[model samples]
Target: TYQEFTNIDQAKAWGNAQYKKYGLSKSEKEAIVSYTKSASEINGKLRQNKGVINGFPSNLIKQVELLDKSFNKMKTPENIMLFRGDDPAYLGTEFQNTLLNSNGTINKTAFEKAKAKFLNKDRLEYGYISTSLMNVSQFAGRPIITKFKVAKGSKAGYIDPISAFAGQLEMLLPRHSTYHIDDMRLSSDGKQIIITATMMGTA
Candidate 1:
């Protein structure tokens, strides 16, 4: 069993404790706190536009990947900050559905609105990767392990072509996403294992 934060202050307290436990510096704590607030702000704003964007704002696909990656360690306040809701991955499906009906064209109005809120005041290709720690964290350790059953004749990967088009105008929002997968390996043992991965991307 694990514990979850009840509120932002509580989340901050946990983050602070982690900082102390790991001997994180003042700057590190401040950075994490600042980022927590920012991610929350961006996420809240995005929700307000959920109907407008018709779905995931194409801008956040990668950032949300980081968002999804961080879920494995939600006990960390930093990771908690990245939680868009109880249903984070649902947006991906919504976007996919929208693309399907819309004939693969993104919602123009929603795109422009999100651009103003998430992208740089200047450029659309760049945006902030909204999360506390996409890479290193006493909380979010790397190479996420998902319990996917792969039989001898089966293969799997997370790539989505439709969602790939969702990445057209924006590569990485000036304020969005990262990654890890030094390599892939399978284990049948029931014992718990820690996997390390390298995460690199926008802020």
Candidate 2:
């Protein structure tokens, strides 16, 4: 059976529990799962964009590689059965697509608009990486994930999950609009995931 990384805690717990289930000692399981994470990694970039710039978290990519090297544990290396949607990546694609067109010439308007909206804001880059291997048809399927709320006068275009996720900027607007996502998940038996978020209207 495959495991879904619901969140940080869930991912960690699964590693610990799965390793111990097959008769491995508790210490052995813990040792296998033990990974180093420096506090500086997160906050070091936060001081005026000096830290925490993108989607994967701090130095999370390097840390994951380090874990693989030390533990020799690579989860599902050959097969990548995607369970959830990738919006943040899509948002970045749109940003890129808007900039570049079929002729290989840059779309100045789209590029400038995206720059004003996402890049100057310092959005995460890793969340959206379109590999050269993939074809054109699959490009538009990517999504955008945002924690930043929408501005006023914006109508609801997709959904309203509390305030909204990082990719969802439509909800932040003054005008109500539905936020969109490729898939909405609940529980295995169809129970809701129960998301908690905040929303405050302007005066």
Candidate 3:
């Protein structure tokens, strides 16, 4: 019963085990990420206008609020769909292996090799969050975020083919083994697979 209840789903098992072991039921458990959700439905008065890009995003509450009023206000009906992008700018000292090519085209050779070895994953070490897990530092877990052209706009919005091509080759040229952007969401859904957002440098 415990295994089925706690050892199946990673998040659930992790949380349930911790709770049972410490004898911490929801009623008495300390406040954590297990319980979080949207404040309310999309408010028309303040959607896009409410969303804040930079600064403390309104500074008053302290702590960075990723979803604020400023960000909400700027959004419209069309923009209602999740508009994700890569970090507009790189901040850390890490380097992406460039999963694309100079011509911005998809190379079949590289992708095939990666699949054979089962060495491809989206985010090697990143973060993905939703309402159930709001706190970034706490609910920090990397989801294999991929990309797909929602409403075909331009080739500019696509990732460089050379990076992916090279990345696929690099993934197979390993001796002692290596990590990669695991192709986890290839069949889940087109939208979920292609997580390219304007937030990152991809756009």
Candidate 4:
């Protein structure tokens, strides 16, 4: 009843086979594959965190003591909820909040409020503790490159539309495909540096 769980391609092919059985379109099948890929990477992200904290020389004990003090002090819900954005893939307010507020330094006040709702030790250990550490490295800031389809003759604060239009298009080509713009553009009025990205798969 088991396929090679270690092989992502095999797992995806099996999933595609099932989707085909239900008469799904190629895009739908691919979408499922993309979702699977995202979930797999999320799992990978979690494991790497675990490896640093729990593996080899064993820094796990040292990290947990700090995490303990951080979560034990929260008193209000807003401090917990406001600490981070919601992630649909994560369950429970405590785990999600901890994951969101977590970083090189965990948010003590945020975790305090978040932990009150988790009444059992098992939940505290496996839920928040297990999930929060992963966010530390996941949120490590990366460099931002500008990627905009700026119209000629229009200029944003630091964005010279005349020169930058299609400037990033070269990155999307086959040879430079690994490149990504981590952040965004300042509005022409110097009011905002807004940006967004569309997540896609091996299309």
Q: Pick by TM-score: which candidate is best?
A: 1
**Best-fitting candidate, measured by lDDT?**
1
Question: lDDT tens string, model 2, 1-203?
Answer: 22223353443343344333334344423322332123223223333353234555544545433322322221222111112123222335555445445654434565345445434232222111111111112322333212222222221111111111222111112111122222222323321121111222211
Question: Candidate 2 local accuracy as lDDT?
Answer: 0.28
Candidate scoring better on TM-score of 1 and 4: 1
Candidate 3 local lDDT, 43-110, one digit each (tens):
21122334332432343222122222112221111111122223201211221233333453323343
- Report the lDDT tens digits of candidate 4 across residue range 1-203: 11112343443343334323343334433333332224334334334464233442333333333322322221111111001112312324454434333232334453343334322222111212111101122221211112222122211111111112221101010000111222333334332222222211110
Worst 10 residues of 1 by lDDT: 153-162
**Least accurate 10 contiguous residues by lDDT in model 2:** 126-135
Q: Any idea what lDDT model 3 has?
A: 0.22
TM-score versus the correct structure, for each prediction: 0.22, 0.21, 0.20, 0.20
* lDDT at 27, model 1: 42
lDDT (10s digit) by residue, model 1, range 147-185: 111121111111111122221111111222233323222
Alpha carbon lDDT at 84, candidate 3: 23
